[PDB]
Amino acid sequence: MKVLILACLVALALARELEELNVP
Amino acid sequence: SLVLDQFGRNLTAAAMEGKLDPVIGREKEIERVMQVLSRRTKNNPVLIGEPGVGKTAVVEGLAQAIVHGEVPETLKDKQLYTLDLGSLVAGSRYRGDFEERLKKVLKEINTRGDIILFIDALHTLVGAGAAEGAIDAASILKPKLARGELQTIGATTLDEYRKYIEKDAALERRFQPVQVGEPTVEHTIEILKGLRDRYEAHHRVSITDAAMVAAATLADRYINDRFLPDKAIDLIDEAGARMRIRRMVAEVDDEQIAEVLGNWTGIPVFKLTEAETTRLLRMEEELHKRIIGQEDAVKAVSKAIRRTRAGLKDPKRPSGSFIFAGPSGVGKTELSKALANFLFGDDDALIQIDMGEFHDRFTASRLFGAPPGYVGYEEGGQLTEKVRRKPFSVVLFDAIEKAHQEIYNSLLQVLEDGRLTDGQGRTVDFKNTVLIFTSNLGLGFSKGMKQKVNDELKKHFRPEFLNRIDDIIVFHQLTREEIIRMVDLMISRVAGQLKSKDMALVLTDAAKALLAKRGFDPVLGARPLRRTIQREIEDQLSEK
Amino acid sequence: VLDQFGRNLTAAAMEGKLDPVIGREKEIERVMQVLSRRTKNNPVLIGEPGVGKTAVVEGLAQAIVHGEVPETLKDKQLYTLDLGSLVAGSRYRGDFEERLKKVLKEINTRGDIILFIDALHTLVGAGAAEGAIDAASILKPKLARGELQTIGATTLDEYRKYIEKDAALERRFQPVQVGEPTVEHTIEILKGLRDRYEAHHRVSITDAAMVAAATLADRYINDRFLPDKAIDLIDEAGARMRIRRAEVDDEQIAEVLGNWTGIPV
Amino acid sequence: VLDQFGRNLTAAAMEGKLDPVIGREKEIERVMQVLSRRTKNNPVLIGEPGVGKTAVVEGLAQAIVHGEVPETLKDKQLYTLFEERLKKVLKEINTRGDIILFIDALHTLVGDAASILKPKLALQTIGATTLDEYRKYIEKDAALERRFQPVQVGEPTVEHTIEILKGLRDRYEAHHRVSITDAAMVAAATLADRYINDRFLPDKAIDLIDEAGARMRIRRMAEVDDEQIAEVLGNWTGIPVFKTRLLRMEEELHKRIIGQEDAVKAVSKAIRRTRAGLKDPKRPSGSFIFAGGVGKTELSKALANFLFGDDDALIQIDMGEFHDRFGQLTEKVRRKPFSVVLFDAIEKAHQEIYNSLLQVFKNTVLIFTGLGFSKGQLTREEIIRMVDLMISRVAGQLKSKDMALVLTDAAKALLAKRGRPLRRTIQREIEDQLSEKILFEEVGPGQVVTVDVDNW
Ligand SMILES: Nc1ncnc2c1ncn2[C@@H]1O[C@H](COP(=O)(O)OP(=O)(O)OP(=O)(O)O)[C@@H](O)[C@H]1O
Ligand SMILES: Nc1ncnc2c1ncn2[C@@H]1O[C@H](COP(=O)(O)OP(=O)(O)O)[C@@H](O)[C@H]1O
Ligand SMILES: Nc1ncnc2c1ncn2[C@@H]1O[C@H](COP(=O)(O)OP(=O)(O)O)[C@@H](O)[C@H]1O
Ligand SMILES: Nc1ncnc2c1ncn2[C@@H]1O[C@H](COP(=O)(O)OP(=O)(O)O)[C@@H](O)[C@H]1O
């Protein structure tokens, strides 16, 4: 009864793209 | 060409190979798609629809409309590709690999110009190839889609169209929502009749025309977790897949799908067995093996179940809505447990909502869920979540006289319309349940009730709730002659809890008339009587 | 499907490395009934954790070798698949998706694969999110056309929270309810498994041990289910006998139950 | 060959490169229970960061070469270990079938190498996690939990740790050329459970006699004793050396009598009966109730400084408006045992904080705190002993202004009459009226200010 649910959204755990180090 | 083949599947080449099943109907829907695809700018349709209504089947109908040439000339010789967005994210570890793969797709589409790029699950486009520092595949396609230089069909669930395309309001502009609706039942029969040869060939069974007519009407009436142009194919398959199973031809008929649907929801929809028909005609007598001496209720709950099993029930009302009135202890819950025993073989197969645990409305949220924002929203309702799992289920609203005046008003929608939307937002069906309302109920100078107990239900319930109850049954108080019959039931099955060396209690003596007397009063029920049989002759003849 | 992310349960069943499955013959027929469908042939095994849901499929993988197939499940290899093992090792983009598109490429080329994925609560959200590319977006086009036969396994709560709350995932996995077995069914499980436990521990397990293991486990243990809490008692008692060394009875499985639960004697 | 990727524990065990552990035999036995099973034959060794999990398997490797072992684990090897060489080494484990790998970071294999184990088992695996990491990673993967068994490794007690130091005695007498005594190792364990809370015993005590032997072989360029482990513990915790615990308390506690003197003497005897002599440590030390004085928070500040910690080890928990929750007492004692715990309110009567306060943790001080026709607490002189404290903060700031706040005894008497609000009336009268005189330079540096207040 009128106890509110508090969604509490997480920060985005997401992928990462890459700069790569060039080699021969 | 070769770039599109490794990032997606050609549906036009799949329609030449006959790998796409026939799409019977959806002529006005594919016409709407080809109308949107023939635009100059924003020629991008989205098949929004309920999940399973044939959103990706409309595009399969388009891919075999191109091969048949039933498209207009502006869409003739188009190559319709299901763009695999996972194929583009695949092997994109480094920065700019995904954005290279997507611009290589679009360079081939601008080169050929005969590409309609069907993106199934268009909600996955927002965030496709989105990394820490990347460009999502939405923002690469947004200049293409707005100018109409990229023909792209989307297909998105209406639930998944709120959360990911209406949360990206720029991308919603670039598309046109083509509402693929849930078809009617007569349209679904033509879908099923058109898919007759595909499921004849894979299940090696002939499927008759009445079986197609059944599995559309049986799915619409008795299945609610899915949509028509799918839950009807679902009954055709597990019909024919059982015939591949049990035979390791046999026709699929009305009986072959009703036995699937009986093993599907637990709703007996059978074309009735003669052995099942006999025990339904003597249902009033086979419920006399647990309760005795009612003879008005046990007949009137037998009339409602035969009305259900003969198919003559109102398909928008419940299978039976009852009030079990009368004094306490006369077999109110014992009839509901008997009614659950006849229909399931289990006395705890019913759903007993104890209405004495409710007295106000500010705890009345366990039977229709909590509204959004409030706690109890993701596990909303204990009545609803048990009825959408057992749609055929006797539910028992025990002790309704100890409840609130405004909690049976939530169930007032259940009695007429047979539905109840929980707090989560989901309509559950009570159209096949058997609703039971158990109630515990002369004074002065009169020359010598049924009349006052109707007036006292008119005091407690509103006459609008009683208006929607199908049968109101006042129970007759147990005569001292039939308490002789009542104690004979306890010496058999409650003495069947006993072990058969630890007892010899079926004596046939005259002392059961004394057991019939001890434990019963004209104000008490037979519960203060079923306790005295246990603790005086059964449970103390057993501890030695 | 490679042996990197799972193993071939039919090749294990051909070599006889899987557990003998006594009981659950009716549930295997319901899995074969869902797998014999032309579309949506995806049986999710809904049951409490450790009721024998893999033991349904281990018996199903034997039934491929034993020839109890409906001729549409004939010579179908059944690679199990840890869905979380594809997740493991993904911090960068296209790590999960490449290893998922590889294992779906090795099904179209090979052509007889029946995936057994456990943990379908992991399916929703296997990638970043649902708007992102997850395994609950890659599998779904092939789970509606019958071109991908995946056998699932949820609990009942994971099925309610993750699949019944997911639109367009209820319709692609068809529920097969693997129930909680009774006490006599559990003994018959133990009667079939005893040729493995008496040959692994090199002990002899008496008939009195199993009638006690199916009774004492229900009587004292409530956080975990029967067709596992009863298998465990005659497993550790064979190991405790191998450690103390041989015959397991209702006294040898007795002190094994007393090790865990807070019983001094 | 696998010696060039990982290394043996059994070849190290026979040579003597592994140190023995004297206790921990129920935990090694539990591992041999788990591995001898047909299914779930892989122990996970749930422990804590330091309690000794690798210590079980390097003692298990000693059990192989000795023979206090099952014959299903007799003559076996315990190794301790990109995709192409990972499959290369696990093929060498499969083609023998007689070797077992150990992983100290098993939670980092599902955080693959996890379902590689299943056709290579058809190999064994001994894992090592913490109890946090077992809940995060091992329990989450359901296809992993079918093969692994939760094997508990708990924190050892102090008398158990002395046995461990007894076994790890010849290792340090040989390494540092030092002669360590029994007293030292008793004090190196009973002060390791005491003063160190970022680590756990098995290590907290071994770190002391390792550094003590390192301190002896340093400053001589003899003998570690009781007085070494305190100064070795002195710099290594930043605490100066005062750690003999004369019985328990003394009058030093009752020096800072910030108020009622009979209260301070009553609290003094109350813990000297519950710290040494009686009160088994399965119930926490202290465990007494305040009565409804000064305000009682300042009295508990002297309690924390004198026995366990500084004033920071006193924790004020309010329950005046925190009585609808499930809690900060659990977290702050988790970081620091031997905590002096203070509950400022107990008169808020509810059934939720009833439950949180029954179950309370082996060593922590727990504290709970006019219409008639009628003519018939600190006293008058006991306010004056708090007045000079609450102006010492004012005079302590005027010394940098080259001033000395001298209060006459009559002005302190009236300041007792007007002043919990004794703090505020000094800020209103002694501070604010003086500060405007400092800005006016009526008083200033080179002046000893004398605030007399007549009409007292
Ligand atoms: N008009 C139709 N004619 C023939 N078959 C149809 C038609 N509509 C639907 N179907 C069939 O019913 C099923 C519907 O699944 P489909 O994926 O096509 O629909 P959907 O609503 O887009 O589902 P999802 O959202 O899961 O992709 C398929 O087997 C499809 O072939
Ligand atoms: N019709 C009946 N036939 C046989 N026994 C009955 C019958 N009705 C009641 N009893 C017995 O008397 C008890 C009275 O309980 P019942 O009237 O069923 O519950 P309630 O009063 O809560 O509706 C039952 O539990 C059963 O043991
Ligand atoms: N007929 C059977 N039913 C259930 N479990 C069985 C059966 N035969 C063997 N088992 C045991 O079941 C276990 C396999 O795990 P399983 O019970 O399938 O887990 P889950 O039910 O959580 O999927 C093994 O201990 C195996 O020996
Ligand atoms: N029972 C014991 N006997 C001897 N040394 C032990 C014992 N337990 C732990 N140690 C020592 O404690 C240190 C930590 O080892 P271990 O407990 O395996 O670490 P971790 O807790 O990080 O797994 C090592 O020097 C080890 O030899």
Beta bridge partners of B419: B429
Phi-psi label, residue D366: left if phi above 0, alpha if psi -120 to 50, beta otherwise? beta
The CA R_g of chain C, rounded to the nearest whole Å, is 20
Dump the DSSP string for B80-120.
EEEE-HHHHHTT--BTTHHHHHHHHHHHHHHHH--EEEEEE
Where helices occur in D221-327 by DSSP H, the ranges are: 228-237, 261-275, 297-306
| Cβ burial B461-481 (10 Å sphere, 16+ → b, else e) | beeebbebbbebbbbeebeee
- List the single residue in A14, A17, A18 with the smallest CB-CB distance to C128: A14
Q: Which ligand ends up closest to the CA of D171?
A: 4
The token pair at D116 is: 């590689």
CB contact under 8 A, A15 and B131: yes
- Distance (Å, rounded) from C-alpha D423 to C-alpha B397? 65
- List the single residue in A12, A13, A16 with the smallest CB-CB distance to C92: A16
Beta bridge partners of B47: B155, B178
Contacts of C96 (CB under 8 A, 6+ apart): C86, C87, C90, C126, C127, C134, C135
The token pair at D398 is: 């005027």
The token pair at D369 is: 């705190």
- Distance (Å, rounded) from C-alpha D2 to C-alpha D4? 5
Ligand 4 lining (C-beta closer than 6 Å): D 19, 21-24, 47, 49-55, 128, 164, 167-168, 202-203, 206
Beta bridge partners of D449: none
- Distance (Å, rounded) from C-alpha D54 to C-alpha D104? 7
Could you tell me the distance, in angstroms and rounded to a whole number, from the CA of residue D100 to the centre of ligand 3? 25
- Distance (Å, rounded) from C-alpha C55 to C-alpha B525? 50
CA angle B284, B285, B288 (to 5 degrees): 100
Task: From C74, C154, C75, C149, select the one nearest C115 (Cα to Cα).
Answer: C149
Q: Which residue has the tokens 């609808």?
A: D324
CA angle D100, D105, D111 (to 5 degrees): 115
- Distance (Å, rounded) from C-alpha B213 to C-alpha B189? 6
Element (H, E) at B153: none
Residue pair D423/D430 in contact by the 8 Å Cβ criterion:
no
Task: From D288, D294, D297, D298, select the one nearest D266 (Cα to Cα).
Answer: D288
Task: From B263, B254, B184, select the one nearest C174 (Cα to Cα).
Answer: B263
Residue pair B266/B433 in contact by the 8 Å Cβ criterion:
no
Could you tell me if C131 lies within 8 Å of chain A, comparing CB atoms? no
Q: Which amino acid is at C182?
A: T
Task: From D287, D306, D305, D298, select the one nearest D263 (Cα to Cα).
Answer: D298
Q: Is the dihedral of CA C234, C238, C241, C247 positive or negative?
A: positive
- Distance (Å, rounded) from C-alpha D208 to C-alpha D212? 6
D47 in a known ligand binding site = yes
Residue pair B268/C74 in contact by the 8 Å Cβ criterion:
no
Q: Which residue has the tokens 């609130």?
A: B404
- Distance (Å, rounded) from C-alpha D397 to C-alpha C13? 85
Task: From D127, D111, D201, D194, select the one nearest D163 (Cα to Cα).
Answer: D201
- Distance (Å, rounded) from C-alpha C238 to C-alpha C201? 5
Residue pair B519/B531 in contact by the 8 Å Cβ criterion:
yes
Where helices occur in D103-181 by DSSP H, the ranges are: 117-121, 131-133, 142-145, 158-167, 170-175
- Distance (Å, rounded) from C-alpha B189 to C-alpha B182? 13
- Distance (Å, rounded) from C-alpha B42 to C-alpha B176? 8
Task: From D97, D148, D103, D102, select the one nearest D123 (Cα to Cα).
Answer: D97
* Final resolution, Å: 2.8
Chain breaks in chain A (C to N over 2.5 A) after: none
Q: Which residue has the tokens 């409710």?
A: B358
Q: Which residues of A touch C92 (CB under 8 A)?
A: 15-18
The token pair at D227 is: 């007085």
Element (H, E) at D8: strand D7-8
D167 in a known ligand binding site = no
Contacts of D334 (CB under 8 A, 6+ apart): none
- Residue C192 CA: nearest ligand 3 atom is 8
Give the burial class of D446: count Cβ atoms within 10 A of its Cβ; 0-12 exposed, 13-18 middle, 19 or more buried. exposed
- Distance (Å, rounded) from C-alpha B457 to C-alpha B284? 26
D89 in a known ligand binding site = no
Instruction: With H, G, I as helix, E, B as strand and everything else as coil, classify residue D450.
Output: strand
Beta bridge partners of C116: C80, C151
Q: Which ligand ends up closest to the CA of D56?
A: 4
- Distance (Å, rounded) from C-alpha C202 to C-alpha C198? 5
Q: How many other C-beta atoms can be found within 10 angstroms of the C-beta atom of residue B8?
A: 22
Structure-determination approach: cryo-EM
Q: How many other C-beta atoms can be found within 10 angstroms of the C-beta atom of residue B282?
A: 12
Could you tell me if D114 lies within 8 Å of chain C, comparing CB atoms? yes
Task: From B337, B347, B363, B333, select the one nearest B439 (Cα to Cα).
Answer: B333
- Distance (Å, rounded) from C-alpha C171 to C-alpha B49? 14
Element (H, E) at D84: helix D83-94
Residue pair C62/C13 in contact by the 8 Å Cβ criterion:
yes
- Distance (Å, rounded) from C-alpha C235 to C-alpha C245? 16
| Measured CA distances, C119 to B217, B312, D34, D141, D398 (Å) | 35, 44, 25, 8, 70
- Indicate the length of chain D as a whole number: 456
| A contact set with B (CB within 8 A) | 1-5, 14-20
Is the distance from the beta carbon of residue B331 to the nearest atom of ligand 2 less than 6 Å?
A: yes
Let me know if chains D and B touch, i.e. at least 3 Cβ pairs under 8 angstroms: no
Q: Tell me the best of B284, B328, B334, B353 to mutate to test the pocket of ligand 2, counting ligand atoms within 8 Å of each CB and taking the most.
A: B334
Could you tell me if D40 lies within 8 Å of chain C, comparing CB atoms? yes
Dump the DSSP string for chain C.
--SSSS-BHHHHHHHT-SPP--S-HHHHHHHHHHHT-SSS--EEEE--TTSSHHHHHHHHHHHHHHT---SSSTT-B-BEEEHHHHHTT-SBTTHHHHHHHHHHHHHHTT--BEEEEE-TTTTTTSSS-SSS--HHHHSHHHHTTTS-EEEEEE-SHHIIIIISSSTTTTTTSEEEE-PPP-HHHHHHHHHHHHHHHHHHS---B-HHHHHHHHHHHHHH--SS-HHHHTTTHHHHHHHHHHHH---B-TTTTHHHHHHHSS---
Q: Which amino acid is at D100?
A: I
Dump the DSSP string for D190-246.
HTHHHH--SS-HHHHHHHHHHHHHHHHHHHT-----TTHHHHHHHHHHT--S-----
- Distance (Å, rounded) from C-alpha C255 to C-alpha C233? 10
| A contact set with C (CB within 8 A) | 12-18
Is the distance from the beta carbon of residue C58 to the nearest atom of ligand 3 less than 6 Å?
A: no
Contacts of B84 (CB under 8 A, 6+ apart): B7, B8, B9, C101
Could you tell me if D37 lies within 8 Å of chain C, comparing CB atoms? yes
Q: Which amino acid is at D445?
A: P
Could you tell me the distance, in angstroms and rounded to a whole number, from the CA of residue B330 to the centre of ligand 2? 5
Task: From B123, B56, B120, select the one nearest B87 (Cα to Cα).
Answer: B120
Q: Which ligand ends up closest to the CA of D199?
A: 4
Q: Which ligand ends up closest to the CA of D192?
A: 4
Give the closest residue (by CA) to ligand 1 atom 5. B23
Could you tell me if D140 lies within 8 Å of chain C, comparing CB atoms? yes
- List the single residue in A4, A5, A16 with the smallest CB-CB distance to B131: A16
Contacts of C171 (CB under 8 A, 6+ apart): B51, B52, B226, B227, B230, B231, C40, C144
- Indicate the length of chain C as a whole number: 265
The token pair at B242 is: 């059982």
Contacts of B527 (CB under 8 A, 6+ apart): B328, B329
Task: From D420, D428, D430, select the one nearest D258 (Cα to Cα).
Answer: D420
Could you tell me the distance, in angstroms and rounded to a whole number, from the CA of residue D103 to the centre of ligand 4? 15
Q: Which amino acid is at C49?
A: P
Give the closest residue (by CA) to ligand 1 atom 2. B23
The token pair at D332 is: 């702050």
Could you tell me if C95 lies within 8 Å of chain B, comparing CB atoms? yes
Could you tell me the distance, in angstroms and rounded to a whole number, from the CA of residue B387 to the centre of ligand 4? 56
Could you tell me if C39 lies within 8 Å of chain B, comparing CB atoms? yes
The token pair at B267 is: 């709703």
- Distance (Å, rounded) from C-alpha B30 to C-alpha B418? 35
CB contact under 8 A, C92 and A15: yes
Q: Which residues of C touch A16 (CB under 8 A)?
A: 91-93
The token pair at C122 is: 């992991």
Could you tell me the distance, in angstroms and rounded to a whole number, from the CA of residue D205 to the centre of ligand 2? 70
- Distance (Å, rounded) from C-alpha D180 to C-alpha D213? 8
Element (H, E) at D404: none
Looking at the complex, report in whole angstroms how far the Cα of residue C187 sits from the nearest Cα belonging to chain D: 18
Q: Which residue has the tokens 């605490």?
A: D239
Q: Which residues of B touch C144 (CB under 8 A)?
A: 56
Q: How many other C-beta atoms can be found within 10 angstroms of the C-beta atom of residue B530?
A: 18
Chains within contact range of chain B (3+ C-beta pairs < 8 Å): A, C
Q: Which residue has the tokens 């029994």?
A: D182
Instruction: With H, G, I as helix, E, B as strand and everything else as coil, classify residue B502.
Output: coil
Ligand 1 lining (C-beta closer than 6 Å): B 21-26, 49, 51-57, 155, 157, 191, 194-195, 229-230, 233; C 39, 144, 168, 171
Is the distance from the beta carbon of residue B329 to the nearest atom of ligand 2 less than 6 Å?
A: yes
Task: From D278, D280, D255, select the one nearest D268 (Cα to Cα).
Answer: D255
The token pair at B300 is: 């009137």
- Residue D55 CA: nearest ligand 4 atom is 18
Q: Chain centroid to CA B101: how far?
A: 43
Q: Which residue has the tokens 């190979």?
A: B17
- Distance (Å, rounded) from C-alpha C125 to C-alpha C104? 18
C47 in a known ligand binding site = yes
